[PDB]
Coordinates of C-alpha atoms in Angstrom, one line a residue:
Chain A
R1 CA -163.6 -149.7 69.4
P2 CA -162.4 -150.1 65.9
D3 CA -159.3 -152.4 65.7
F4 CA -157.6 -149.8 63.5
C5 CA -157.4 -147.4 66.6
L6 CA -154.7 -149.6 68.0
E7 CA -152.4 -149.1 65.0
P8 CA -149.4 -146.9 65.5
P9 CA -149.7 -143.5 63.7
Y10 CA -148.4 -143.6 60.1
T11 CA -146.9 -140.6 58.4
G12 CA -146.4 -142.2 55.0
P13 CA -144.0 -141.2 52.2
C14 CA -145.2 -137.7 51.3
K15 CA -143.5 -134.3 51.9
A16 CA -146.2 -132.4 53.9
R17 CA -145.9 -131.6 57.6
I18 CA -149.5 -131.5 58.8
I19 CA -151.0 -132.2 62.2
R20 CA -153.4 -135.0 62.4
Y21 CA -154.8 -137.0 65.3
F22 CA -154.5 -140.6 66.2
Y23 CA -155.8 -142.7 69.0
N24 CA -153.0 -143.7 71.5
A25 CA -154.5 -146.9 72.8
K26 CA -151.9 -147.0 75.6
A27 CA -152.3 -143.4 76.9
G28 CA -156.0 -143.8 76.2
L29 CA -156.5 -140.5 74.3
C30 CA -156.1 -138.9 70.9
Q31 CA -152.8 -137.2 70.2
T32 CA -151.0 -135.2 67.5
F33 CA -148.6 -136.6 64.9
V34 CA -147.2 -135.4 61.6
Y35 CA -148.8 -136.7 58.4
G36 CA -147.0 -136.7 55.1
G37 CA -150.2 -136.1 53.1
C38 CA -150.7 -139.4 51.3
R39 CA -151.5 -143.0 51.9
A40 CA -153.2 -142.5 55.2
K41 CA -154.0 -145.5 57.4
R42 CA -157.3 -145.4 59.4
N43 CA -156.0 -144.1 62.8
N44 CA -155.6 -140.6 61.2
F45 CA -158.1 -137.8 61.8
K46 CA -158.3 -134.3 60.4
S47 CA -160.4 -133.4 63.5
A48 CA -159.6 -134.3 67.1
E49 CA -163.4 -134.4 67.8
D50 CA -163.8 -137.2 65.1
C51 CA -160.9 -138.9 66.7
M52 CA -162.2 -139.1 70.2
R53 CA -165.7 -139.9 69.0
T54 CA -164.4 -142.8 66.7
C55 CA -161.8 -144.3 69.1
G56 CA -162.9 -143.0 72.6
Chain B
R1 CA -154.4 -121.0 86.9
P2 CA -153.2 -124.6 86.4
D3 CA -149.5 -125.4 87.1
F4 CA -148.9 -126.3 83.5
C5 CA -149.6 -122.7 82.5
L6 CA -146.1 -121.8 84.0
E7 CA -144.0 -124.4 82.1
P8 CA -142.1 -122.9 79.1
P9 CA -143.3 -123.8 75.6
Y10 CA -142.2 -127.2 74.3
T11 CA -141.5 -127.7 70.5
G12 CA -141.0 -131.4 70.9
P13 CA -138.9 -133.8 68.8
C14 CA -141.0 -133.7 65.5
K15 CA -140.3 -131.5 62.5
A16 CA -143.5 -129.7 61.7
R17 CA -143.6 -125.8 61.9
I18 CA -147.0 -125.5 63.5
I19 CA -148.0 -122.2 65.2
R20 CA -149.4 -122.6 68.7
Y21 CA -150.1 -120.6 71.8
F22 CA -148.6 -120.9 75.2
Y23 CA -149.3 -118.9 78.3
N24 CA -146.3 -116.6 79.2
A25 CA -146.5 -116.1 83.0
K26 CA -143.6 -113.6 83.0
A27 CA -145.5 -111.4 80.4
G28 CA -149.0 -112.1 81.6
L29 CA -150.6 -113.2 78.3
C30 CA -150.6 -116.0 75.6
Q31 CA -147.9 -115.8 72.8
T32 CA -147.0 -117.8 69.7
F33 CA -144.4 -120.5 69.7
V34 CA -143.5 -123.2 67.0
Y35 CA -144.7 -126.6 67.8
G36 CA -143.1 -129.7 66.2
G37 CA -146.3 -131.7 65.8
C38 CA -145.9 -134.5 68.4
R39 CA -145.4 -135.2 72.1
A40 CA -147.0 -131.8 73.2
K41 CA -147.0 -130.6 76.8
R42 CA -150.1 -129.0 78.3
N43 CA -149.0 -125.4 77.8
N44 CA -149.9 -125.8 74.1
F45 CA -153.1 -124.4 72.5
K46 CA -154.4 -124.6 69.0
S47 CA -156.6 -121.6 69.9
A48 CA -155.5 -118.3 71.5
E49 CA -158.9 -117.9 72.9
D50 CA -158.5 -121.3 74.7
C51 CA -155.1 -120.2 76.0
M52 CA -156.2 -116.9 77.5
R53 CA -159.2 -118.4 79.2
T54 CA -157.5 -121.6 80.5
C55 CA -154.4 -119.8 81.7
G56 CA -156.0 -116.3 82.3
Chain C
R1 CA -157.2 -131.7 86.4
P2 CA -158.4 -128.2 86.7
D3 CA -161.5 -127.9 88.9
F4 CA -163.2 -125.9 86.2
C5 CA -163.4 -129.0 84.0
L6 CA -166.1 -130.4 86.3
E7 CA -168.4 -127.4 85.7
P8 CA -171.4 -128.1 83.5
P9 CA -171.1 -126.5 80.1
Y10 CA -172.5 -122.9 80.0
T11 CA -174.0 -121.4 76.9
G12 CA -174.5 -117.9 78.3
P13 CA -177.0 -115.2 77.2
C14 CA -175.8 -114.5 73.6
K15 CA -177.5 -115.2 70.3
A16 CA -174.8 -117.3 68.4
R17 CA -175.1 -121.1 67.9
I18 CA -171.5 -122.2 67.8
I19 CA -170.0 -125.5 68.6
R20 CA -167.5 -125.5 71.5
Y21 CA -166.1 -128.3 73.6
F22 CA -166.4 -129.1 77.2
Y23 CA -165.1 -131.8 79.4
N24 CA -167.8 -134.2 80.6
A25 CA -166.3 -135.4 83.9
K26 CA -168.9 -138.2 84.1
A27 CA -168.5 -139.7 80.6
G28 CA -164.8 -138.9 81.0
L29 CA -164.3 -137.1 77.6
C30 CA -164.7 -133.9 75.8
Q31 CA -168.1 -133.3 74.0
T32 CA -169.9 -130.7 71.9
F33 CA -172.3 -128.1 73.2
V34 CA -173.7 -124.8 71.9
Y35 CA -172.2 -121.5 73.0
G36 CA -174.0 -118.3 72.8
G37 CA -170.9 -116.2 72.0
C38 CA -170.3 -114.3 75.3
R39 CA -169.5 -114.7 78.9
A40 CA -167.8 -118.0 78.6
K41 CA -166.9 -120.1 81.6
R42 CA -163.6 -122.0 81.7
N43 CA -164.9 -125.5 80.5
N44 CA -165.3 -124.1 77.0
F45 CA -162.8 -124.8 74.1
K46 CA -162.7 -123.6 70.6
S47 CA -160.6 -126.7 69.9
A48 CA -161.3 -130.3 70.9
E49 CA -157.5 -130.9 71.1
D50 CA -157.1 -128.1 73.7
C51 CA -160.0 -129.6 75.5
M52 CA -158.6 -133.1 75.9
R53 CA -155.2 -131.8 76.6
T54 CA -156.4 -129.4 79.3
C55 CA -159.0 -131.7 81.0
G56 CA -157.9 -135.2 79.9
Chain D
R1 CA -152.4 -99.7 75.3
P2 CA -154.6 -97.8 72.9
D3 CA -157.7 -96.0 74.0
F4 CA -160.2 -97.6 71.8
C5 CA -159.2 -100.7 73.8
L6 CA -161.4 -99.2 76.5
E7 CA -164.7 -99.1 74.6
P8 CA -167.5 -101.5 75.2
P9 CA -168.2 -104.1 72.6
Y10 CA -170.6 -103.1 69.8
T11 CA -172.7 -105.8 68.1
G12 CA -174.2 -103.2 65.7
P13 CA -177.6 -103.4 64.0
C14 CA -177.1 -106.3 61.5
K15 CA -178.3 -109.8 61.9
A16 CA -175.2 -112.1 61.7
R17 CA -174.0 -114.1 64.7
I18 CA -170.2 -113.9 64.4
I19 CA -167.9 -114.4 67.3
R20 CA -165.4 -111.5 67.6
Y21 CA -163.0 -110.4 70.4
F22 CA -162.9 -107.2 72.4
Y23 CA -160.5 -106.1 75.2
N24 CA -162.3 -106.0 78.5
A25 CA -160.3 -103.5 80.6
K26 CA -162.2 -104.5 83.8
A27 CA -161.3 -108.2 83.6
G28 CA -157.9 -107.3 82.0
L29 CA -158.2 -109.7 78.9
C30 CA -159.8 -110.1 75.5
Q31 CA -163.2 -111.8 75.5
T32 CA -165.7 -113.0 73.1
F33 CA -168.7 -111.1 71.9
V34 CA -171.3 -111.4 69.1
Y35 CA -170.8 -109.1 66.1
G36 CA -173.8 -108.5 63.9
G37 CA -172.0 -107.9 60.7
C38 CA -172.1 -104.2 59.8
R39 CA -170.9 -100.9 61.5
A40 CA -168.2 -102.3 63.7
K41 CA -166.4 -100.0 66.2
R42 CA -162.7 -100.2 66.8
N43 CA -162.6 -102.5 69.8
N44 CA -163.4 -105.5 67.6
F45 CA -161.0 -108.2 66.4
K46 CA -161.5 -111.2 64.1
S47 CA -158.5 -112.8 65.8
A48 CA -158.0 -113.3 69.6
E49 CA -154.2 -113.1 69.1
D50 CA -154.6 -109.7 67.4
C51 CA -156.7 -108.6 70.4
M52 CA -154.2 -109.8 73.1
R53 CA -151.3 -108.3 71.2
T54 CA -152.9 -104.9 70.4
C55 CA -154.6 -104.3 73.8
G56 CA -152.6 -106.7 76.1
Chain E
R1 CA -153.4 -94.8 64.8
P2 CA -151.1 -96.1 67.6
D3 CA -147.4 -95.6 67.3
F4 CA -146.4 -99.2 66.8
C5 CA -148.2 -99.2 63.4
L6 CA -145.0 -97.4 62.2
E7 CA -142.5 -100.1 63.3
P8 CA -141.3 -102.0 60.3
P9 CA -142.6 -105.7 60.1
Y10 CA -140.6 -108.1 62.2
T11 CA -140.1 -111.7 61.1
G12 CA -138.4 -112.9 64.3
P13 CA -135.9 -115.6 65.0
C14 CA -138.3 -118.6 64.6
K15 CA -138.5 -121.1 61.8
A16 CA -142.1 -121.0 60.5
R17 CA -143.0 -119.1 57.3
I18 CA -146.5 -117.8 58.1
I19 CA -148.4 -115.0 56.4
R20 CA -149.2 -111.9 58.6
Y21 CA -150.3 -108.4 58.0
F22 CA -148.6 -105.1 58.9
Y23 CA -149.6 -101.5 58.4
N24 CA -147.2 -99.9 55.9
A25 CA -147.3 -96.2 56.9
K26 CA -145.7 -95.0 53.6
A27 CA -148.2 -96.6 51.2
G28 CA -150.9 -96.0 53.9
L29 CA -152.3 -99.6 53.7
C30 CA -151.9 -103.0 55.3
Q31 CA -149.7 -105.6 53.4
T32 CA -148.4 -109.1 53.8
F33 CA -145.1 -110.3 55.3
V34 CA -143.6 -113.5 56.7
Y35 CA -143.6 -114.0 60.4
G36 CA -141.3 -116.8 61.8
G37 CA -143.6 -118.0 64.6
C38 CA -142.4 -116.3 67.7
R39 CA -141.7 -113.0 69.4
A40 CA -144.0 -111.0 67.3
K41 CA -143.9 -107.2 67.6
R42 CA -147.2 -105.4 67.8
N43 CA -147.4 -104.3 64.1
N44 CA -148.3 -107.9 63.2
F45 CA -151.8 -108.9 62.4
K46 CA -153.2 -112.4 61.8
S47 CA -156.2 -110.8 60.1
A48 CA -156.2 -107.9 57.6
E49 CA -159.5 -106.5 58.7
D50 CA -157.9 -106.1 62.2
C51 CA -154.8 -104.5 60.7
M52 CA -156.6 -101.8 58.7
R53 CA -159.2 -101.2 61.5
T54 CA -156.4 -100.8 64.2
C55 CA -153.8 -99.0 62.0
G56 CA -155.6 -97.5 59.0
Chain F
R1 CA -159.4 -98.1 41.2
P2 CA -162.3 -99.9 39.4
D3 CA -165.6 -98.0 39.0
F4 CA -167.4 -101.0 40.8
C5 CA -165.4 -100.2 44.0
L6 CA -167.8 -97.2 44.4
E7 CA -171.3 -98.8 44.2
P8 CA -173.0 -99.4 47.6
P9 CA -172.8 -102.9 49.2
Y10 CA -175.5 -105.3 47.9
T11 CA -176.7 -107.6 50.6
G12 CA -179.0 -109.3 48.0
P13 CA -182.3 -111.3 48.2
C14 CA -181.1 -114.4 50.0
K15 CA -181.6 -115.6 53.5
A16 CA -178.0 -116.4 54.7
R17 CA -176.1 -114.0 56.9
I18 CA -172.4 -114.1 55.8
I19 CA -169.9 -111.4 56.6
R20 CA -168.3 -109.9 53.5
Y21 CA -166.1 -106.9 52.8
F22 CA -166.7 -103.9 50.6
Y23 CA -164.9 -100.8 49.7
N24 CA -166.2 -97.7 51.4
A25 CA -165.3 -95.1 48.8
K26 CA -166.2 -92.3 51.2
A27 CA -164.3 -93.6 54.3
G28 CA -161.4 -94.7 52.0
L29 CA -161.2 -98.3 53.3
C30 CA -162.9 -101.7 53.3
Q31 CA -165.7 -102.3 55.8
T32 CA -167.9 -105.2 56.6
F33 CA -171.5 -105.9 55.4
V34 CA -173.8 -108.9 55.5
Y35 CA -174.2 -110.8 52.2
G36 CA -177.3 -112.8 51.7
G37 CA -175.8 -115.7 49.7
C38 CA -176.8 -115.1 46.0
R39 CA -176.7 -112.6 43.3
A40 CA -173.5 -110.9 44.6
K41 CA -172.3 -107.7 43.0
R42 CA -168.7 -106.9 42.5
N43 CA -168.0 -104.7 45.6
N44 CA -168.1 -107.9 47.7
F45 CA -165.0 -109.7 48.8
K46 CA -164.6 -112.9 50.8
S47 CA -161.1 -111.7 51.8
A48 CA -160.4 -108.3 53.4
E49 CA -156.9 -108.5 51.9
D50 CA -158.4 -108.8 48.4
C51 CA -160.7 -105.9 49.0
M52 CA -158.0 -103.4 49.9
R53 CA -155.7 -104.9 47.2
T54 CA -158.3 -104.4 44.5
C55 CA -160.2 -101.2 45.6
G56 CA -157.6 -99.5 47.9
Chain G
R1 CA -162.0 -106.3 33.5
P2 CA -159.1 -104.3 35.1
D3 CA -155.8 -104.1 33.2
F4 CA -154.0 -105.7 36.2
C5 CA -155.9 -108.9 35.6
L6 CA -153.6 -109.5 32.6
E7 CA -150.1 -109.1 34.2
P8 CA -148.3 -112.5 35.0
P9 CA -148.5 -113.9 38.5
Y10 CA -145.8 -112.5 40.8
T11 CA -144.6 -115.0 43.3
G12 CA -142.2 -112.3 44.8
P13 CA -138.9 -112.5 46.8
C14 CA -140.1 -114.0 50.0
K15 CA -139.6 -117.5 51.4
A16 CA -143.1 -118.7 52.2
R17 CA -145.1 -121.0 50.0
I18 CA -148.7 -120.0 50.0
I19 CA -151.3 -120.9 47.5
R20 CA -152.9 -117.9 45.8
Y21 CA -155.2 -117.4 42.8
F22 CA -154.5 -115.3 39.7
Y23 CA -156.5 -114.6 36.5
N24 CA -155.1 -116.4 33.5
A25 CA -156.1 -114.0 30.8
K26 CA -155.2 -116.6 28.2
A27 CA -157.1 -119.6 29.6
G28 CA -159.9 -117.3 30.6
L29 CA -160.1 -118.3 34.3
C30 CA -158.4 -118.2 37.7
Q31 CA -155.6 -120.6 38.4
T32 CA -153.3 -121.2 41.3
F33 CA -149.7 -120.0 41.9
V34 CA -147.4 -119.9 44.8
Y35 CA -147.1 -116.5 46.6
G36 CA -143.9 -115.9 48.6
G37 CA -145.4 -113.7 51.3
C38 CA -144.5 -110.1 50.6
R39 CA -144.6 -107.5 47.9
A40 CA -147.7 -108.9 46.3
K41 CA -149.0 -107.5 43.0
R42 CA -152.7 -107.0 42.2
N43 CA -153.3 -110.2 40.2
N44 CA -153.2 -112.2 43.4
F45 CA -156.2 -113.3 45.4
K46 CA -156.6 -115.1 48.7
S47 CA -160.1 -116.2 47.6
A48 CA -160.8 -117.9 44.2
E49 CA -164.3 -116.5 44.4
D50 CA -162.8 -113.0 44.6
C51 CA -160.5 -113.7 41.6
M52 CA -163.3 -114.8 39.2
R53 CA -165.6 -112.0 40.5
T54 CA -163.0 -109.3 39.9
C55 CA -161.2 -110.5 36.7
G56 CA -163.8 -112.9 35.2
Chain H
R1 CA -167.9 -130.1 31.4
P2 CA -170.1 -132.8 32.9
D3 CA -173.8 -132.6 32.4
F4 CA -174.8 -131.9 36.0
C5 CA -173.0 -128.6 35.8
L6 CA -176.2 -127.4 34.0
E7 CA -178.7 -128.4 36.7
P8 CA -179.9 -125.3 38.5
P9 CA -178.6 -124.9 42.1
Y10 CA -180.6 -126.9 44.7
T11 CA -181.1 -125.6 48.3
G12 CA -182.7 -128.8 49.6
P13 CA -185.2 -129.3 52.4
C14 CA -182.8 -128.8 55.3
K15 CA -182.6 -125.9 57.7
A16 CA -179.0 -124.5 57.4
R17 CA -178.1 -121.4 55.4
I18 CA -174.6 -122.2 54.1
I19 CA -172.8 -120.7 51.2
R20 CA -171.9 -123.1 48.2
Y21 CA -170.9 -122.6 44.6
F22 CA -172.6 -123.7 41.4
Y23 CA -171.6 -123.4 37.8
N24 CA -174.0 -121.0 36.1
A25 CA -174.0 -122.2 32.5
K26 CA -175.7 -119.0 31.1
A27 CA -173.2 -116.5 32.6
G28 CA -170.5 -119.2 32.1
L29 CA -169.0 -118.7 35.7
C30 CA -169.4 -120.2 39.2
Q31 CA -171.6 -118.2 41.7
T32 CA -172.8 -118.4 45.2
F33 CA -176.1 -119.9 46.5
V34 CA -177.6 -121.1 49.8
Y35 CA -177.6 -124.8 50.5
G36 CA -179.8 -126.0 53.3
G37 CA -177.4 -128.7 54.7
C38 CA -178.6 -131.9 53.1
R39 CA -179.4 -133.9 50.0
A40 CA -177.1 -131.8 47.8
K41 CA -177.2 -132.3 44.0
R42 CA -173.9 -132.6 42.2
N43 CA -173.8 -129.0 41.0
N44 CA -172.9 -127.8 44.5
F45 CA -169.4 -127.0 45.4
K46 CA -167.9 -126.2 48.8
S47 CA -164.9 -124.5 47.1
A48 CA -165.0 -122.1 44.2
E49 CA -161.7 -123.4 42.7
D50 CA -163.3 -126.9 42.5
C51 CA -166.4 -125.5 40.9
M52 CA -164.6 -123.7 38.1
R53 CA -162.0 -126.4 37.6
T54 CA -164.8 -129.1 37.4
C55 CA -167.4 -127.1 35.4
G56 CA -165.7 -124.1 33.8
Chain I
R1 CA -168.8 -140.4 36.9
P2 CA -166.6 -138.0 34.8
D3 CA -163.5 -139.2 33.1
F4 CA -160.9 -136.8 34.6
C5 CA -161.9 -138.7 37.8
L6 CA -159.7 -141.5 36.4
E7 CA -156.5 -139.6 36.1
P8 CA -153.6 -140.1 38.5
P9 CA -152.9 -137.3 41.0
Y10 CA -150.6 -134.5 39.8
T11 CA -148.4 -132.7 42.4
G12 CA -147.0 -130.4 39.7
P13 CA -143.6 -128.6 39.8
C14 CA -144.1 -126.0 42.6
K15 CA -142.9 -126.2 46.1
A16 CA -145.9 -125.9 48.4
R17 CA -147.1 -128.8 50.5
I18 CA -150.9 -128.5 50.3
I19 CA -153.2 -131.5 51.0
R20 CA -155.7 -131.9 48.2
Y21 CA -158.1 -134.8 47.2
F22 CA -158.2 -137.0 44.1
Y23 CA -160.6 -139.8 43.2
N24 CA -158.7 -143.1 43.3
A25 CA -160.7 -145.4 40.9
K26 CA -158.8 -148.4 42.1
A27 CA -159.7 -148.1 45.8
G28 CA -163.1 -146.6 44.8
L29 CA -162.8 -143.4 47.0
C30 CA -161.3 -139.9 47.2
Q31 CA -157.9 -139.8 48.9
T32 CA -155.3 -137.3 50.0
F33 CA -152.3 -136.2 48.0
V34 CA -149.8 -133.4 48.1
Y35 CA -150.4 -130.5 45.6
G36 CA -147.4 -128.3 44.9
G37 CA -149.2 -125.1 44.1
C38 CA -149.1 -124.5 40.4
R39 CA -150.3 -126.3 37.2
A40 CA -153.0 -128.5 38.7
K41 CA -154.8 -131.1 36.6
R42 CA -158.5 -131.7 36.8
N43 CA -158.5 -134.6 39.3
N44 CA -157.7 -132.2 42.2
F45 CA -160.1 -131.0 44.9
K46 CA -159.7 -128.5 47.7
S47 CA -162.6 -130.2 49.5
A48 CA -163.0 -133.9 50.1
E49 CA -166.8 -133.5 49.9
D50 CA -166.5 -131.9 46.5
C51 CA -164.4 -134.9 45.5
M52 CA -166.8 -137.6 46.8
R53 CA -169.8 -135.8 45.3
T54 CA -168.3 -135.2 41.8
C55 CA -166.5 -138.5 41.4
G56 CA -168.4 -140.7 43.9
Chain J
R1 CA -166.4 -150.8 58.8
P2 CA -167.6 -150.1 62.3
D3 CA -171.3 -150.8 63.2
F4 CA -172.0 -147.2 63.9
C5 CA -171.3 -146.4 60.3
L6 CA -174.8 -147.9 59.5
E7 CA -176.9 -145.9 62.0
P8 CA -178.8 -143.0 60.4
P9 CA -177.6 -139.4 61.0
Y10 CA -178.7 -137.9 64.4
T11 CA -179.5 -134.2 64.6
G12 CA -179.9 -134.4 68.4
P13 CA -182.0 -132.1 70.7
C14 CA -179.9 -128.9 70.4
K15 CA -180.7 -126.0 68.1
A16 CA -177.5 -125.2 66.2
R17 CA -177.4 -125.7 62.3
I18 CA -174.0 -127.2 62.0
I19 CA -173.1 -129.1 58.8
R20 CA -171.6 -132.5 59.4
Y21 CA -170.9 -135.8 57.6
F22 CA -172.4 -139.2 58.1
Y23 CA -171.6 -142.4 56.2
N24 CA -174.6 -143.4 54.0
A25 CA -174.4 -147.2 53.7
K26 CA -177.3 -147.4 51.2
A27 CA -175.5 -144.9 48.9
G28 CA -171.9 -146.0 49.6
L29 CA -170.4 -142.6 50.6
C30 CA -170.4 -139.8 53.2
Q31 CA -173.1 -137.1 52.8
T32 CA -174.0 -133.9 54.7
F33 CA -176.6 -133.7 57.4
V34 CA -177.5 -130.9 59.9
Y35 CA -176.2 -131.5 63.5
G36 CA -177.9 -129.7 66.4
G37 CA -174.7 -129.2 68.4
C38 CA -175.0 -131.7 71.3
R39 CA -175.4 -135.3 72.2
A40 CA -173.9 -136.5 68.8
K41 CA -173.8 -140.2 67.9
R42 CA -170.8 -141.8 66.3
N43 CA -171.9 -141.5 62.7
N44 CA -171.1 -137.8 62.9
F45 CA -167.9 -136.3 61.4
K46 CA -166.6 -132.7 61.4
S47 CA -164.4 -133.7 58.5
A48 CA -165.5 -135.5 55.3
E49 CA -162.1 -136.9 54.9
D50 CA -162.4 -138.6 58.3
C51 CA -165.8 -139.9 57.4
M52 CA -164.8 -141.6 54.2
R53 CA -161.7 -143.2 55.8
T54 CA -163.4 -144.4 59.0
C55 CA -166.5 -145.6 57.2
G56 CA -164.9 -146.5 53.8

């Protein structure tokens, strides 16, 4: 499992309010958080599928 | 019909304005509510189809 | 966890070749399968999010 | 509810494999069916929410 | 065309600003409006094809 | 309305099967047809909204 | 091309902020503008494809 | 406009039948074609806005 | 690669909050940025694939 | 850069023609391949954005 999947989700400094998915290491599944629209870190997925499959 | 299908919709603490679907037991079908983007409860569906079939 | 999440995925008799998601009880996560487009059973989700959240 | 809501789903002659939604009076909910692309009848919805709200 | 197709469009008390279609009986065509995310009335269509097929 | 709104729908030579909208001068509204993927003619719209707005 | 392809883009009175396309008669192509959600005018397309096809 | 915008559209050896846009240098506008799913050449756009902004 | 690929992202003046993609020469890949809705500059892509293929 | 980012794309045994993204290490960016719809390996991304960030 990529180390980056253990990083807290990261909204960044931008205005948008968009759903993205991140791996919650502790709950052990992908959840939703709000993403500003810029300067994404790696635990950030457009698609929940991609999320589970990358950090499952 | 899972228990969670009877809990009221939960916006959550986040500040997004994301349309979602919850099963309305009183009414007997899925309806739209506004989801804040994080900390979702289980009566929350990105897809209306998924909502009617899971809670139908 | 809804009992229906333990049912094998079910393509049905229709022509379409569409991705949908089902809960693989054994692997313990949601995966892709092909859905014919009609006569869905309950372990079938338009959205991977909805899938995890309903059968996680 | 409207009366076209009582018609059976019509795939029509054309060759596309597009998921659409029809009200199924019997089961009392909107379901998926394959629409062929041309010559649709009235019990036929692009959006499941439209179907639940119109024929629900 | 069903009676509700004559109801004026209804935004609702919710906080989203999402595009929906309504049948405008005067002009005799479907048009856009802003729906606020919840408590939609029946003359409210996510898809335009559904609006004109159901009300036009 | 533009004179192109009257010409029949042109599926074209290509092999794809994509739902597109066209103005049905006779029936007075926009209906679906199957576009092939190339050599489109002008009575051909990706969006049903656009079709009614332009040819309605 | 239709005479409506020349009129300026009409954002309108409504509160939404939706990206739409319009024909820029001057620059000779379709550009983006922000539509408000209601009282659209005809130089307004949901699909960029439609815009170039109609006004190009 | 970059040179590749002049390359004719390329379907590829793959088996899908997906709509894409290419700049057609003769006509001087972007148009549709069928891409087969793999080994796209650069004059191949998922979005039309991107095609005309990049090649038009 | 084209030279507009070297420009910095431009949000422009308008108020929408739409994720778009720009090539970031420094990091050597396309990234997200917020586009405002009007007056886009050329290093601006609706689709990430378009961005990677055009400026990759 | 996870190991899986270097495995070749895998269509799988299913018969869908679903566009997806894999990271091409040889080329140094994500490209499209055709995914059969089941039994996906990890170098499979519904979203190009997710692909470039996970394997970039």
